[PDB]
Amino acid sequence: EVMEQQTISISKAGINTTLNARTSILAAANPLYGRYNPRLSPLDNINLPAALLSRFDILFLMLDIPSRDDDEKLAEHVTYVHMHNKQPDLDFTPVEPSKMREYIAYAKTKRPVMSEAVNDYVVQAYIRLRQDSKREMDSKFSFGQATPRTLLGI
Amino acid sequence: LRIIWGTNVSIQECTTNFRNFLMSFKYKFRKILDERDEELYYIKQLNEMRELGTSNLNLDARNLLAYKQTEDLYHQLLNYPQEVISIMDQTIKDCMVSLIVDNNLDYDLDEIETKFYKVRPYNVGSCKGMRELNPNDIDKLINLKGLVLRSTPVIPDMKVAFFKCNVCDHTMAVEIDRGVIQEPARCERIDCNEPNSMSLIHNRCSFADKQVIKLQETPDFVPDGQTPHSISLCVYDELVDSCRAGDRIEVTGTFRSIPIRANSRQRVLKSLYKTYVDVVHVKVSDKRLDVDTSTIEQELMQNKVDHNEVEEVRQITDQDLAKIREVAAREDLYSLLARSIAPSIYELEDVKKGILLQLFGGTNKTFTKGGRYRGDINILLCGDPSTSKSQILQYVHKITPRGVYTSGKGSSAVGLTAYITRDVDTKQLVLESGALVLSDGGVCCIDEFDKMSDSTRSVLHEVMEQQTISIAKAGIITTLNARSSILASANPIGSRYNPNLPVTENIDLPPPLLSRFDLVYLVLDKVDEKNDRELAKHLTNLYLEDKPEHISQDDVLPVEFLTMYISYAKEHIHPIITEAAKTELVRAYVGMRKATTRQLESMIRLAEAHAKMKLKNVVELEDVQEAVRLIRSAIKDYAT
Numbered sequence: 001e002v003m004e005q006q007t008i009s010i011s012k013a014g015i016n017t018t019l020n021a022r023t024s025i026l027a028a029a030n031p032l033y034g035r036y037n038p039r040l041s042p043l044d045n046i047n048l049p050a051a052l053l054s055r056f057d058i059l060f061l062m063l064d065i066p067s068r069d070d071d072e073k074l075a076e077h078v079t080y081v082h083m084h085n086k087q088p089d090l091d092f093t094p095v096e097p098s099k100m101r102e103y104i105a106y107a108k109t110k111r112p113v114m115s116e117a118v119n120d121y122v123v124q125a126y127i128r129l130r131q132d133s134k135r136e137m138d139s140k141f142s143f144g145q146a147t148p149r150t151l152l153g154i
Numbered sequence: 155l156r157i158i159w160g161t162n163v164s165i166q167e168c169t170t171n172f173r174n175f176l177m178s179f180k181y182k183f184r185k186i187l188d189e190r191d192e193e194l195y196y197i198k199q200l201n202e203m204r205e206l207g208t209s210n211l212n213l214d215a216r217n218l219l220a221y222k223q224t225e226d227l228y229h230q231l232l233n234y235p236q237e238v239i240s241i242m243d244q245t246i247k248d249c250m251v252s253l254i255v256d257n258n259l260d261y262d263l264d265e266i267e268t269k270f271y272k273v274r275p276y277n278v279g280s281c282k283g284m285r286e287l288n289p290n291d292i293d294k295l296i297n298l299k300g301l302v303l304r305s306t307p308v309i310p311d312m313k314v315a316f317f318k319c320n321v322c323d324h325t326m327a328v329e330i331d332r333g334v335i336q337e338p339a340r341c342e343r344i345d346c347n348e349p350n351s352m353s354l355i356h357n358r359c360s361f362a363d364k365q366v367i368k369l370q371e372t373p374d375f376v377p378d379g380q381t382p383h384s385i386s387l388c389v390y391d392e393l394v395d396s397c398r399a400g401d402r403i404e405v406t407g408t409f410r411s412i413p414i415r416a417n418s419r420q421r422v423l424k425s426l427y428k429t430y431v432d433v434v435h436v437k438v439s440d441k442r443l444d445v446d447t448s449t450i451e452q453e454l455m456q457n458k459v460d461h462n463e464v465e466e467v468r469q470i471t472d473q474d475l476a477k478i479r480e481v482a483a484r485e486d487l488y489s490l491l492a493r494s495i496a497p498s499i500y501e502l503e504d505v506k507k508g509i510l511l512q513l514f515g516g517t518n519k520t521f522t523k524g525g526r527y528r529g530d531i532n533i534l535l536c537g538d539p540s541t542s543k544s545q546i547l548q549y550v551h552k553i554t555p556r557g558v559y560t561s562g563k564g565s566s567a568v569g570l571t572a573y574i575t576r577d578v579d580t581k582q583l584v585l586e587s588g589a590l591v592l593s594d595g596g597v598c599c600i601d602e603f604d605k606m607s608d609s610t611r612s613v614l615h616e617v618m619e620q621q622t623i624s625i626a627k628a629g630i631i632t633t634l635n636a637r638s639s640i641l642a643s644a645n646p647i648g649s650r651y652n653p654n655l656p657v658t659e660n661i662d663l664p665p666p667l668l669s670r671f672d673l674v675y676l677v678l679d680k681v682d683e684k685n686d687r688e689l690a691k692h693l694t695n696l697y698l699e700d701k702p703e704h705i706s707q708d709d710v711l712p713v714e715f716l717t718m719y720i721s722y723a724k725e726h727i728h729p730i731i732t733e734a735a736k737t738e739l740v741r742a743y744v745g746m747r748k749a750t751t752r753q754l755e756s757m758i759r760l761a762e763a764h765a766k767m768k769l770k771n772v773v774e775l776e777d778v779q780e781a782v783r784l785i786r787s788a789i790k791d792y793a794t
């Protein structure tokens with residue numbers, strides 16, 4: 001319900017109130033046991049109903065397939081730290097969370113507005129996304145249908 | 155220049171200051187409104203006052219701001235409300251008398267002047283909630299909003315005390331005035347002397363009435379992390395009972411701070427003062443939201459006239475009426491209003507439309523006794539997600555005066571009526587109105603109806619049929635009335651409900667309950683190509699302007715007009731279907747039977763709403779056609 005934002009409604013007992021939750025939600029979840037069976041379609045190995053997923057604008061599915069090249073790099077990373085506390089070297093400068101929070105704070109103040117061109121582009125790309133999502137039709141692949149919340153989301 | 159000790163409000167000279175205004179105002183308000191009625195308001199309105207003798211001139215605040223003089227008196231009224239209101243009362247009385255002596259003999263003759271005239275200033279300031287307020291403002295005029303949870307019975311309060319003697323006996327009595335009753339030790343008749351006990355006889359003394367209305371405020375503009383606070387406002391006098399529980403009310407009054415004894419034995423006071431609102435003025439009706447029905451009000455019309463009062467039922471001028479009766483002529487009206495209801499929401503017109511009739515629903519019937527089918531019409535709607543099905547709920551919620559909005563699973567059969575909670579202020583057991591009882595009249599809105607627990611929904615089989623709820627539990631045993639529309643949202647299992655399958659299966663639900671709903675919408679996407687482009691043109695707008703304007707434009711739309719229209723339609727029309735209907739009316743029902751009898755009930759109620767609109771006291775044989783088609787509309791959507 002909270003993806004209608006601005007709402008919870010508690011009708012029980014001594015409470016008739018409807019309080020305001022402006023919350024954002026990030027949800028870490030595990031696919032159906034054990035891990036993401038590829039012989040199963042998406043939405044099969046994701047146990048969650050489609051009523052809810054339409055609400056999520058961005059679903060990052062992180063799947064793990066062993067790769068000899070990359071996992072070397074990883075191991076180098078997780079060995080380097082522990083071994084050191086500070087991770088990046090040669091070269092990057094990690095932005096301290098304090099000043100970062102400042103920047104984001106100064107970011108939230110703007111309230112931008114779309115140009116006509118980008119608008120039309122959004123529309124056309126949205127038809128293509130709808131149509132391509134549904135022409136998929138039956139299973140595999142998916143999730144459909146690329147419901148308007150994905151448009152508004154984008 | 156005199157003064158009042160703390161108030162910097164000079165007695166009189168603010169009376170002059172107020173009179174030049176009161177006698178001469180007109181409209182300077184339109185200079186704030188920017189213009190784009192001629193003669194002054196207050197002498198006319200004060201005349202209406204004097205013939206009607208309703209007293210209670212409620213002023214405005216701000217008529218004052220902005221006008222010169224009295225640019226100052228506005229500040230002096232917001233800051234020092236009580237004293238200033240007393241001054242203004244006096245001024246108005248004297249202005250009355252002085253207005254009479256112009257016309258010589260007035261109203262037979264000199265009595266009415268001595269009668270008490272009092273101000274009920276309103277519309278004062280844009281204030282932030284209750285919670286926001288500092289101790290810096292203890293006594294000030296303050297605005298509030300939000301529904302009313304409960305109200306205590308009338309508590310009697312002293313005005314003139316009474317006393318008798320053991321000797322001789324003599325009957326004299328001391329008036330309260332300031333908040334204590336100081337009784338003479340001794341004595342009158344004998345006197346004497348003598349130190350003989352002075353009895354206080356409490357049945358002979360005079361009282362006034364103090365009620366207490368609990369209030370759940372919505373300031374909106376919520377700063378967070380705050381959760382809805384509760385407030386308690388003590389009204390007084392005539393205002394008593396003038397507010398039903400569950401209304402959304404604009405009330406203004408003076409903020410207040412009083413200590414409350416901790417021990418209840420010892421003299422001790424608890425420090426840490428407890429605060430509340432004194433509510434000088436109430437503002438029940440609104441322009442932006444729809445108007446309450448007459449039949450439901452009943453007594454509070456039949457009563458509240460006798461002791462008189464102000465406000466209540468929304469009043470309409472003449473020429474705007476002349477505009478309504480004009481708009482009714484427009485042929486596309488039934489279509490027109492349907493597009494005007496949800497401006498943001500695109501297409502799906504028959505949903506907008508069925509709901510449009512939910513706003514006009516039915517015609518109330520008492521027979522000799524009993525009867526009472528009301529106007530109630532009830533609507534479930536299901537379909538693919540992201541179809542705006544919730545948005546409608548929000549909108550209907552906003553318009554409908556008394557409605558209440560509940561989520562699925564956030565609900566329980568105890569929650570929807572009769573809490574019988576401990577009051578905790580008095581440490582007593584007090585009855586609270588559940589969510590359906592509040593929703594009585596207007597529209598209850600429901601989220602995720604499919605998802606309700608099995609014990610719940612067992613409440614609805616009571617409401618939908620009987621139109622009342624029967625509570626035999628716990629303390630008090632009674633059948634209390636909740637007459638309310640229901641608009642329920644549903645998500646089919648799919649959640650895309652998909653082609654084929656039995657639909658009647660695919661809404662889930664027990665089918666008996668499902669057949670009970672008046673009009674059941676099934677919304678579907680045919681993937682029109684050719685649609686999504688158009689729809690994206692609609693939504694991907696705004697865009698511009700960032701400050702929202704021209705939403706559906708260019709489209710002809712009413713805005714505040716449709717609410718006064720809808721109201722008017724509801725109070726001044728009572729459609730009957732006469733003869734013409736019955737043939738076709740029945741043959742429809744049979745045609746469906748060839749379903750259940752409820753579908754007939756449905757048709758005759760739903761249709762009479764159509765006929766309620768268009769200002770027809772009688773139904774046409776026509777207009778029952780679409781009235782069926784709306785039920786068939788979902789069937790053209792049941793094909794798959």
Ligand SMILES: Nc1ncnc2c1ncn2[C@@H]1O[C@H](COP(=O)(O)OP(=O)(O)O)[C@@H](O)[C@H]1O
Nearest residue numbers: 148498499500501538539540541542543544545
């Ligand atoms: N025809 C339409 N016109 C305008 N807005 C729409 C339309 N269809 C969908 N939307 C937008 O998509 C969202 C619909 O979400 P909603 O239908 O409440 O989700 P659910 O169907 O799961 O309850 C709303 O923000 C609404 O504004």
